[PDB]
Each structure stands twice: as C-alpha cells, then as structure tokens.
Amino acid sequence: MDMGISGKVAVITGSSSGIGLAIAEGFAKEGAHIVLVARQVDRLHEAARSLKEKFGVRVLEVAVDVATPEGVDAVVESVRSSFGGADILVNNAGTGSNETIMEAADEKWQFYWELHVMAAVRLARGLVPGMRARGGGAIIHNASICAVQPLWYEPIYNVTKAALMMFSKTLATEVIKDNIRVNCINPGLILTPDWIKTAKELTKDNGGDWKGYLQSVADEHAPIKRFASPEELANFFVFLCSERATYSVGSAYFVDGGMLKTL
Amino acid sequence: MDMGISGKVAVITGSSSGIGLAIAEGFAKEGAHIVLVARQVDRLHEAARSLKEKFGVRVLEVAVDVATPEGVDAVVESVRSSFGGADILVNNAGTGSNETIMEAADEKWQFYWELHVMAAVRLARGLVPGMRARGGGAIIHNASICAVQPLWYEPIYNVTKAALMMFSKTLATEVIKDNIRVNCINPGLILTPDWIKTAKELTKDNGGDWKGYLQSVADEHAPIKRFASPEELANFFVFLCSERATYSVGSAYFVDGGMLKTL
Amino acid sequence: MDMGISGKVAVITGSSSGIGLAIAEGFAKEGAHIVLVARQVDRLHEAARSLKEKFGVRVLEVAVDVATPEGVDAVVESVRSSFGGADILVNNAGTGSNETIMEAADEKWQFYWELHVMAAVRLARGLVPGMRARGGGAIIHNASICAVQPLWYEPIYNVTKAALMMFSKTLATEVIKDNIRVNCINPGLILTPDWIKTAKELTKDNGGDWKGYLQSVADEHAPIKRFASPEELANFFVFLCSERATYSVGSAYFVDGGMLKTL
Amino acid sequence: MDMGISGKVAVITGSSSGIGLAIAEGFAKEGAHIVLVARQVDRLHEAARSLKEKFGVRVLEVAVDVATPEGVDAVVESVRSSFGGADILVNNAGTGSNETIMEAADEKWQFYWELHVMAAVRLARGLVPGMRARGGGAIIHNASICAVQPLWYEPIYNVTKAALMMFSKTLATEVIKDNIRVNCINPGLILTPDWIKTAKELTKDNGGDWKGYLQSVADEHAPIKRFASPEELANFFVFLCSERATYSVGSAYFVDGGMLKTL
Ligand SMILES: NC(=O)C1=CN([C@@H]2O[C@H](COP(=O)(O)OP(=O)(O)OC[C@H]3O[C@@H](n4cnc5c(N)ncnc54)[C@H](OP(=O)(O)O)[C@@H]3O)[C@@H](O)[C@H]2O)C=CC1
Ligand SMILES: NC(=O)C1=CN([C@@H]2O[C@H](COP(=O)(O)OP(=O)(O)OC[C@H]3O[C@@H](n4cnc5c(N)ncnc54)[C@H](OP(=O)(O)O)[C@@H]3O)[C@@H](O)[C@H]2O)C=CC1
Ligand SMILES: NC(=O)C1=CN([C@@H]2O[C@H](COP(=O)(O)OP(=O)(O)OC[C@H]3O[C@@H](n4cnc5c(N)ncnc54)[C@H](OP(=O)(O)O)[C@@H]3O)[C@@H](O)[C@H]2O)C=CC1
Ligand SMILES: NC(=O)C1=CN([C@@H]2O[C@H](COP(=O)(O)OP(=O)(O)OC[C@H]3O[C@@H](n4cnc5c(N)ncnc54)[C@H](OP(=O)(O)O)[C@@H]3O)[C@@H](O)[C@H]2O)C=CC1
C-alpha cells in the first residue's frame, strides 16, 4: 500500500529510543525526512546516523528538553531553518509515573503536565502555521491506554495522559480547517527499555527472571498474552499520518492487544 | 508499506456495491483472493468481473442472504470447497433504518437483529474453525458511528449496531488464542449510492439540488465538512487486516471526519 | 429528601425476587403503588403480600413471561384496568448467560434478545401512551456493568445488555418531548440468590466455603472488595425515578463499587 | 428518603453563588453543617448568614483562592480548627474558558490546571486524613459534560475538566480502602449568572432578548430543551454524598438533560 509520504518532513519527539525511534524508522522506511528530538546528544547522533545509512533520507537532530518552552522554540526554529516547516508531527516524548496522590509533591504533578500536555500545546502553536503554509499535515499524540483505563500505581501519568487525549481532540477540531488531521494513539503494553529495567529491578531479590515477570504482566493484562514490539506499534503511527488515512480526524485509536476492558 | 496479504483469502459480506465493494477492491489490489457475498446476483457478477479484470485475482461469488443461517452455511461451504478456509472475514452487509420505537413492528427489529448481529455470529461460528487451521486470521465488523452516537431517525439501526460492536469485542477475546484478531470499524458519513438516492428523493420537490443537500448533511455533522469516499474508508479495513496491525485486538476504530462528538 | 412519588404507579418487571423485589420495596416505602411482574405465580403472590403488608400500598400482580408479546400485552392491560396508566416503569427482568460464541445455539441468542431488548421495546410501546396522558413519567433499564465491560463467560448476556443500554438512550430522545425521562442503570456485583446458589454449586466438592468464593469474586473485580446489597442498589432506582432527578435524561449510571475499569 | 447526613460536615468549594451555593443549601436542608469557600469576602459572608438563618446548621466561611496551595492550606486548617475534619468534600470551584489553542498564553493553561485539577489534588491531600479518622466519607468532583464532549470555544476548559474527571477516578481507587467514596458529576447546561451575563452580552446589538438566546442554546444542545436549575443539579450531589449511595465508587454521573450525544 503506498503511504504517499515520500519527501515529507516528520518531527518525532522522544525519538532517540523506544517507541519514538521505531516511529522514526517507520516514516524513514516510507521515504519521509526525519526530525529527531530528545535530550541525550549521543543516543541522538546514533539514531540519525543509522536512519540516514539505512534509509537515505535527510535527518535533523534537535537535542532539547521538550518539557520547556525554550526547548520547544528550538525544535520549531531548527525545523524552520533546515526544512521550512513540518508536514507531520508526532508527540511521543513522555514517561511513566509512580506515586500515591497522598504523597506526591506538587512539582511532580507540574512536571508531567509540562511534559505530556504543555509540550503538545506548544508544539502545535509553533508548528501548525508552517504546516498550514505547506498545505496541511498530520499530528499524532501518543497518549496511552492509561488515558482511559488508569493503572493503579501511576495516578499522575493517568491524569496527564487523559488531559493529553482531550487536548488531541480539541486540536483536531480547531485545525481541521487547515487541512491538518489530528489523532491520538493509545498503546497497550509495548516492550521498551524501561519495562526491562523495571522487570529486572522487581525480580532482583526473587530469582532475576525478568522475562517471566514481563510474561506475567502480559498474562494479567492482555488477552494477546504478550507485549507489542515498538515496530508493530510504529506501523499504526505511519498509517495514520499517511495519505491513506485522510478521513481520520479527532479519533483515538487503541493499539493494545485486547487490554482495554470496555467497549 | 507492505501489507503481506497477497494470496490470502478474504470473505467480504455486502460487497456487490458501496463500501463492501471498495473494500474488496482494496484487498484485490494487495493480491488477496476475494469471496464476494450479496443477494442480488446481477451486481455480484459485475463486481466479480471487474475485480478479476482490474486486479487479476481469483473471485468467488456467493449470492445469498447472510441474514439467514442457510445463506451463511452456503458461504462457509463455498469457501471450504474453493479455498479450504478464509484468512480474512469482513462483516459488512447491513443497511440503515428509519422509524420510531412507538411505531416500528417487532418484525422490523427482528430483521435488523438477524442482519447486523446474527450474520456475524453465524459467520464466526462457520469460518473460525478453518481460519484457526490456517494459523490465524483477521475478522472486522463494520458497525457505524451510530453504534455509539445514535442518529435520531434510526433507533433500530442504532441498537443493532451497538449490539454488533459488543459482539466484536466478545468474539475478540474468545478467538485471539487462535491467532485470530477481531476488530470493529465505525465509519462516519461515507458517500454511497443510497446517500445519493436519498439526497435526490428528498430534493425532488424543491430544486433537485441533491449535492447541496449532501453538503448540508456534511456541514451539520462533520468538522471535515465532506463525506468520505468509500476508497478512503477501504484503506483502513485493508490495514487492519494486514500483517502490519498485528497488535490490534478487540478495538473499535472510528473513521469519521471528526463526527464523533466525545472523547 | 422528599422523593415526591407518593401515590404514583410503578411497574417493575422481574420483581418477585432479587434486585427487582428490592426496587419494588424501595418504591413501596416511598408510597408508590406497585405492579409486580414475574413468571412464578406463588413467589409473585408472596412478594405482593409482603409489600402490601409492610408498606400499605396497592400491589397488582401480573404473572407472565415479559419476553413474549402476549405477556407484555397482559401487563399493559392490567395496568390500564387497575390504574389507568403507569407513572414509572423499571425494566429489570433479565438473567445471566454462560457459553462460548462457537458453541451457543441460535435459539439461545434469540431468547436473550427477546428477554433483554424486546421486552423493553414492547413495554415502551405499550406503556408510553398512558404515561404521556398522565403528564410524563420515568423509565429505567437495568442493564449491567457488562453492557460496556463484558464478562468473558457470558457473550450473549454482554451483547444483549449492550443492546439494551443503546435502546435506553434512543428511547430517551424519543419520549423526552412527553416529559418522560428514560435512563439506564448499570449495576456491578449485587448479592442476589443466584450468586449464593452459584457459590454453593462451585464449592460443593472443595470445602463448601461459598462465602470464601464470593469474597474472592469481590476481591478480583471490585475496589470496594464486597458485593452490594440489593437494597443499596434499589436506592438509586428510586432516586432516579423521583421528582428530585428531573434533569437526568438519556444517561447511564453505574453503581458498581469501583468495578468499571475505565473512565 | 433519609439521606442520613444530619450533623455531618460538608466542605463545598466555590459556594458563595451558583451551583456551589445551591449544593450548600441542599446539604443544609439535610442537616449537614457547611464549610463555605470562595474568594469574594462580601458575597461569602452574606451567603453564610442566609444559610444559618434558613437552615439552622453551623456555617464556617473560608475566603480564599483554592487555586493556590496557601488557599487550600487555610481551608484545611480552618476545618481542622472548627470541626476536627470533614465528612464530605465537594470540589466545585471552577469557571469556563474561551480561546483558541493557537492564541492562548501558557499562563492561561496554567491557571486552569491549578484551579480545576490542583485544587482537588491539594484538598484531597489535606482533607482525606481527617476524613479517614472520622470513619470515611464522600468526595465529589464537579467536572462538566465538557470533560468527555468538548465545546469548540473552550479548549483549556475541556482539557482541564477531562484531567479532573480522570483525577476523580484515580482518587476513588486510592481512598476506597479508607471507606472514602469518590465520584464525579458532569453537569450539562445549568442556569447560573455567567450564562445570563453571556446571553446579554451576546444579544446587546440584536434586540437584547437574552432569554431567547439561552433558549436557542438549550434547543441546540439538550433534548429536554431547557437549562437545569442549580437546585435540580444539587439534588444529585446530596444524593451521591448520602448514606443511600454507598455502592457508588469511581463513577462519573452525567446530569445533562440528554446533552451527551453518545452512550
Ligand atoms: N512503553 C509502553 O508500554 C507505553 C508507552 N507509551 C508512551 O509512549 C511514549 C514513548 O515511550 P517509550 O518509548 O516507552 O519511552 P522511552 O523512555 O523508551 O523513550 C523516551 C524517549 O523520549 C525522550 N524523552 C523523554 N523525556 C524527554 C524530554 N523531556 N524532552 C525530549 N525528549 C524526551 C527520550 O530520550 P532522552 O531521555 O535522551 O530525552 C527517549 O528518546 C511515551 O509518551 C509513553 O507514555 C504509551 C503506552 C505504553
Ligand atoms: N454508507 C455509510 O455512510 C455508512 C455505512 N456503514 C455500514 O457499511 C456497511 C455497508 O453499507 P453501504 O456500503 O453504505 O451500503 P450499500 O447498500 O451500498 O451496500 C450494502 C451491501 O450489503 C448487501 N446486503 C444487504 N443486505 C444483505 C443481506 N441480507 N445478505 C447479503 N448482502 C446483503 C447489498 O447487496 P444486496 O442488496 O444485493 O444483497 C450490498 O452489497 C453497512 O453495514 C452499513 O451499516 C457504516 C457507517 C456509515
Ligand atoms: N445480580 C447482579 O449481580 C446483577 C444483576 N443485573 C440485572 O438485574 C436484573 C435482575 O437480576 P437479579 O435480581 O440478579 O436476578 P433474579 O433471578 O434474582 O431476579 C430476576 C427476576 O426476573 C424475573 N424474570 C426472569 N425472567 C422473566 C421473564 N421472562 N418474564 C418475567 N419475569 C422474569 C424472575 O422471576 P421468575 O423466574 O419467577 O420469572 C425474578 O423475579 C437482571 O436484568 C440482571 O441482568 C445487572 C448487573 C448485576
Ligand atoms: N453552569 C454550568 O452550565 C456548568 C458548570 N459546571 C461547573 O460547576 C462549577 C460551578 O460553576 P458555576 O456555579 O456555573 O460558576 P459560578 O461562577 O456561578 O460560581 C463559582 C463559585 O466558585 C467561586 N470561585 C471561583 N474561583 C474560585 C477560586 N479560585 N477559589 C475559591 N472560590 C472560587 C466563586 O466565588 P468567587 O468568585 O468569589 O471566588 C463562586 O462562588 C464549576 O466547576 C463549573 O465548571 C459544570 C457544567 C456546567
């Protein structure tokens, strides 16, 4: 199936590893030029190198904290200088939480609000005008199954991802007049490095069988009884931002292996 | 993006015209063999001929009423004998309604229950064993946006489509152990023959401006302010049934131009 | 808080035991006259006597199958005969299922369709006219948490209850012009006879700790870690049918001790 | 119906006028003592006098900004000093927004986050321990129908009310172990002074018929074709915080005259 995004410019936040890198490889595979965004400079250089070598597309690196207005303004200025504007924006930067409401500090709340919601708000403000000038585009928000089905141990994550899923919906209605399609993707269990680090930490005193720990997670949560690969998730991001998904507007698409328990 | 379904067997109910035909064309393009199912045999021939002539695939026609157990049995036996079993089943046969709860006959409720729900129950019972034996597969239920956001004039449609959406999710959990992935797609406004028929009928005594009538429907209901083409929609069905959507299980995916008013 | 329903006529289907009898007692307490509806004549006669004797309200018994048109007709005609019309209607008759989609007979699908969906359809058709003539009224559909969050073992129950929940909403918009407010209640785990019966059955060969079994069910499904009593749930049915809930139209209200896993 | 809250202490934020004052009167009518919280000292002082005279319960005034940590600490301190703790907490303080995402300043996103979400986080942290110590209680969050069905003109409101609804759910699962029941209420159109102010402003130049403007709003959005009264809404607040709603946990209850367009 032709995706029709050859030569389009795709900005992916949090794209030096895990889901965000797999997303960047999937767009690169389809001929899209890539803007990679993350904090660690070295991992970012590796990712760019590998994308260029494997896929022969242009890759720009922006090494900034997207949870800050300065960081966002640098992404916007770098995209403008190198490419003129973006055709695709994937908001993927984000991270799990771990607290009780009774004990969490206000600053922790603030931090996930800036990272999960304010980054998407500021990137929409900064990139929509260029995308509009280029004739339209696609914006995706990677929220989470937690945005609707909260996990008990991460209330701040649940709340901020919930806010992000609403944000995506409100942006979709505001920019569709610009021929800009906005949608949300809500992933289930996706096997990424932090899951492995967590599985090892939690099994350190009972045998170290981190793979069995992950298998029990999938057994308890997903009818599919396994985690997804980042690559299988990325496919959906690429599809939704392609010329083949032109009637998707303001929707939330779950990619979750049966984990959502309700209709 | 490679779909990986070349040479797979796709059964599409309601595929002699409109959306079902566009879906069959989308699968045929990707090299899938096609079983077309509809009642009227004239249009089934014309569609089948056009698919073989345009895409070079095998097409089996089954002219039956899928709202009957005998019709479904015929489809199951045609697939078994011609192909062994199906890899893909798309439940698409269905039709709008138009009544009030206070006036509609019990027999009309029963008609839509058979067509929208029991056809899918019976096809799953009949085709899942062969699909299992082939190593897995994909099943899609075309419900509608109305399965969650009911349109005032068609309560029977709304109820039976809601029931269909729940069926899809329950079948999803039952059969994922067989590597069979079941999902639902909920389309918004899709420009099909019946819409154009209706527009022309509703404007016959006031100017015959059927295009104007369709445009006001779009403006009323969809932020994108147009209907989808059946081809735009077909893409989603093709993607969901492909080797690129292998983590989609028990989900309901809206394709609606913004029409869904809630999160 | 005054419910303002003294002297009103409440029809409760499935009201010789369990949740239905608790709902009838809740209405009786507030001085409503009661139409009790259930199949077993003596259980119904006994429920009627005890309501009349505890609460001093009028009680009419209609011993019929509400899953049949003739049974619904008998209810409508006894209401008309004894009271003129109903002010309140609670669709409560229903029962659990237990099957796989691969194995269940079409006839079983049919039975649950008749009992969960068509009874409410036919009772709305039969009772709305008299309710309208009395100046308005309230109708409730007792669906289930399973209407949105399906239980693995009872797909027919899940599909038919989801259908009921949609019916409730579509009826809501049709009859609000008559000052009739229709809403749905979705209960979680409610301790009824069948629950205790099932706990005793499933523990007959392992120790007969039926209390242990129910506790584990509650522990698995509900954050509050107990079943509701039928009387706790009844309060909500009485409130929603009262002069204090005059802005509730077309809603679904969960009463589930935390069991719903999503927003 | 006995609510069983006579002598309990209910804290209501934003209760010097509108919905919060109606809720405070509703608890008062039921014999609950009242903690009134709002910024404007004058309106608060008189709302307090008028409640005591009219209902003969105790009334504590706390004139603070609950969007600030200092404001919340003053509430918690004054409740501790005057009553020991609270039995009931209603988070009601909040206000509409009005902007585009493209134009809104970061400061404005921040203000709505503090007011609609952080007020509830901070009041949960400050009041739950006293509520726990009293044997349990009830907490309500007044979010909005906009939490799931966004209004085009107030993206910040839609996003922060969505976050508040998720917060309510995450809190409910955390504190149910303390015998504290947390739920959310999502009102539709409720006739409060800002609606009237708005209807006048927007009719200033076309005839001044502010009532007909409100009627056109109700006609467009609500099948019941009128706004609710604050007193109408308040009944559901008092019910949910009463001893008659003991199985309601982590639910979202809409009170919206049919406004919600989906199931
Ligand atoms: N894994 C899972 O099971 C699921 C994940 N998700 C969502 O997917 C998204 C990606 O998660 P995943 O791939 O697991 O996470 P990883 O931790 O593997 O990847 C995070 C990426 O984002 C970058 N990043 C983190 N914070 C910032 C920041 N402030 N500014 C710029 N870049 C940042 C990281 O690089 P660096 O540290 O150098 O900044 C890294 O490239 C997240 O939004 C997550 O919530 C949703 C559902 C499930
Ligand atoms: N068009 C739209 O805006 C939307 C449509 N949908 C759904 O899409 C699906 C396809 O509809 P659409 O393309 O619009 O409609 P069409 O009328 O254009 O297509 C209906 C197809 O179903 C066949 N059909 C109808 N009843 C039966 C039956 N009992 N047995 C076998 N085939 C049958 C028809 O052929 P024949 O009569 O010859 O049997 C025809 O091929 C339906 O389920 C509809 O509810 C969902 C959302 C929006
Ligand atoms: N119990 C629970 O945990 C939950 C229950 N529900 C729903 O609550 C409702 C009542 O359930 P519950 O109290 O548990 O069940 P019970 O079996 O204890 O009560 C069911 C009532 O319905 C009557 N009934 C059943 N079939 C018919 C029929 N065809 N015609 C007329 N009356 C009938 C029964 O009497 P008779 O047999 O004499 O006809 C009985 O009085 C049902 O809709 C159920 O689906 C929803 C969620 C949870
Ligand atoms: N009216 C409607 O149609 C709907 C309203 N709602 C929600 O209902 C709630 C009540 O709104 P409504 O009654 O309409 O609004 P009003 O503006 O009429 O009342 C707001 C009350 O809250 C107080 N308040 C506002 N901000 C603060 C603050 N920062 N700290 C302390 N008190 C504050 C106000 O007093 P003061 O200004 O002196 O501080 C006033 O007493 C809100 O949460 C709103 O979002 C939900 C759905 C619909």
From TrEMBL, chains A, B, C, D:
Gene3D superfamilies, A to Z: NAD(P)-binding Rossmann-like Domain
Annotated GO biological process: monocarboxylic acid metabolic process
Residues annotated to bind NADPH: 14, 16-17, 19, 39-40, 43, 65-66, 92, 142, 157, 161, 190, 192, 195
A single MF term (Gene Ontology): nucleotide binding
InterPro entries xrefs: NAD(P)-bd_dom_sf, Sc_DH/Rdtase_CS, SDR, SDR_fam
Keyword Hydrolase: no
Entry keyword set: Nucleotide-binding
Matching Pfam families: adh_short_C2
Family, similarity comment: Belongs to the short-chain dehydrogenases/reductases (SDR) family.
Name assigned to this protein: NADPH-sorbose reductase
The species this protein was found in: Gluconobacter frateurii
